[PDB]
Amino acid sequence: TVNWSVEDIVKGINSNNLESQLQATQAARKLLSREKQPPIDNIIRAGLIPKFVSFLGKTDCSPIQFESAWALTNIASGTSEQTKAVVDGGAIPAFISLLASPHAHISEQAVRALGNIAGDGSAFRDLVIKHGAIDPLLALLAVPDLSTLACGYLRNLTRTLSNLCRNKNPAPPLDAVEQILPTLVRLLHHNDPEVLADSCWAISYLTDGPNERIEMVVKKGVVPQLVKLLGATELPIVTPALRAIGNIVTGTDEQTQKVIDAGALAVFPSLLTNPKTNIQKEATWTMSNITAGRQDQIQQVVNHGLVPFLVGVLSKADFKTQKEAAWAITNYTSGGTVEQIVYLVHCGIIEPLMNLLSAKDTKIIQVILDAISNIFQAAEKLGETEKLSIMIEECGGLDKIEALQRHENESVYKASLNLIEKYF
Ligand SMILES: [Cl-]
């Protein structure tokens, strides 16, 4: 069945010989598994999807169920229009019936096919849910110990469940999320790196929304496990774990506190120096939504030794990361006590802050300028306003601020002039 033409496949599928149809379907499946440019569109144009879908129901002939399920899975893993062709052929209810197949390799294909369809987008996600996929999917995981399941099979179930958690506008139905979450919590404790990665992605999707979505997740007790995975060695795990934690700290101060209470801040020395740029970037963004919290939460950042790491990120990092660092400092200086803001200067924030004021980005400049203002405000409460003026002179900051009086932006000009006057 290697190297058939689409014309030969169609000839075999149009014979009314179940074994000839089986041969041709397998030929189609191998064509569609090809690495180089599989002829998905040619198979679709030939009108083969509805025949493949009808073969999903031939319970008398499990091999042709398998080959047609795999063929359709491959098509559904392509472009959105390709995925739509599969859905338009009636594949969704047929695949959901195949979840009850006694043949593990056949129910597995149906799991994968439904994951590919649900992962296309919110509409297909919700259509898969409306056809009732969740109950039969969760039943396949209703075992006392996940470790008795075949490794590849458990990974496909995890991947498919995370795709049912994925995408927004809208987010998934609340009742669907509640139904899935307990099984997701269990997968999040399973010791396979790929199951862990995909479960973390699932949690990152569910926490990417309003505070009530976050609370659903936080109430399940998963934050300690997320923090544990935040320290994993595998970057495919750390990345979604860090995303989930970062989402959770965009919520309320009480939700942020659960992350702190679980020990998250002790991982940030590594995260804020991580060789992977996006980890450093997302770790610094997370920090900024922690320094937007309460003064006792700022104080935890201090106690964990993280101000020097923020100074470090400001001084040298990818620019996008330095931008988040700037944000973290301004949030820190808006909400911090006077003692806390003084500590920040004593750690060296001023010189790296000044040096970023020469960046060809207008947003960061207004963020840095705001932070400088909030620091002076604290300097006033101590009268050491004079001494701060000097520091900013001694490192080239006054040169930088003077020129910003004359900037394309008006909010930039307003703030810079308002400072060169009020303090110099
Ligand atoms: Cl674990």
From Swiss-Prot:
ARM repeats: 1-39, 40-79, 80-121, 128-172, 174-210, 211-250, 253-292, 295-337, 338-384, 385-424
Reported modifications of this chain: Ubiquitinated. Deubiquitinated by USP22; leading to stabilization and increased activity.
Primary localisation category: cytoplasm
Domain of life: Eukaryota
Subcellular location(s) of the protein: Cytoplasm; Nucleus
Location of the region described as NLS binding site (major) in the Swiss-Prot/TrEMBL record: 70-166
Single GO MF descriptor: nuclear import signal receptor activity
Keywords: Acetylation, Cytoplasm, Nucleus, Phosphoprotein, Protein transport, Repeat, Transport, Ubl conjugation
Region: NLS binding site (minor), residue numbers: 243-331
Expression sites by tissue: Slightly detected in brain but not in cerebellum and skeletal muscle, highly expressed in testis and spleen.
Gene Ontology annotations of biological process type: entry of viral genome into host nucleus through nuclear pore complex via importin; positive regulation of viral life cycle; postsynapse to nucleus signaling pathway; protein import into nucleus
UniProt subunit comment: Heterodimer; with KPNB1. Component of a complex containing CSE1L, RAN and KPNA2. Interacts directly with CSE1L. Interacts with PLAG1. Interacts with APEX1 (via N-terminus). Interacts with FRG1 (via N-terminus). Interacts with ARL4A, CTNNBL1 and NBN. Interacts with ANP32E. Interacts with SNAI1 (via zinc fingers). Interacts with SNAI2 (via zinc fingers). Interacts with BAG6. Interacts with AIFM2; this interaction likely mediates the translocation of AIFM2 into the nucleus upon oxidative stress. Interacts with RSL1D1.
Domain notes from UniProt: Consists of an N-terminal hydrophilic region, a hydrophobic central region composed of 10 repeats, and a short hydrophilic C-terminus. The N-terminal hydrophilic region contains the importin beta binding domain (IBB domain), which is sufficient for binding importin beta and essential for nuclear protein import.
Its job: Functions in nuclear protein import as an adapter protein for nuclear receptor KPNB1. Binds specifically and directly to substrates containing either a simple or bipartite NLS motif. Docking of the importin/substrate complex to the nuclear pore complex (NPC) is mediated by KPNB1 through binding to nucleoporin FxFG repeats and the complex is subsequently translocated through the pore by an energy requiring, Ran-dependent mechanism.
Family note: Belongs to the importin alpha family.
Name of the protein this chain belongs to: Importin subunit alpha-1
Organism whose genome encodes this protein: Mus musculus
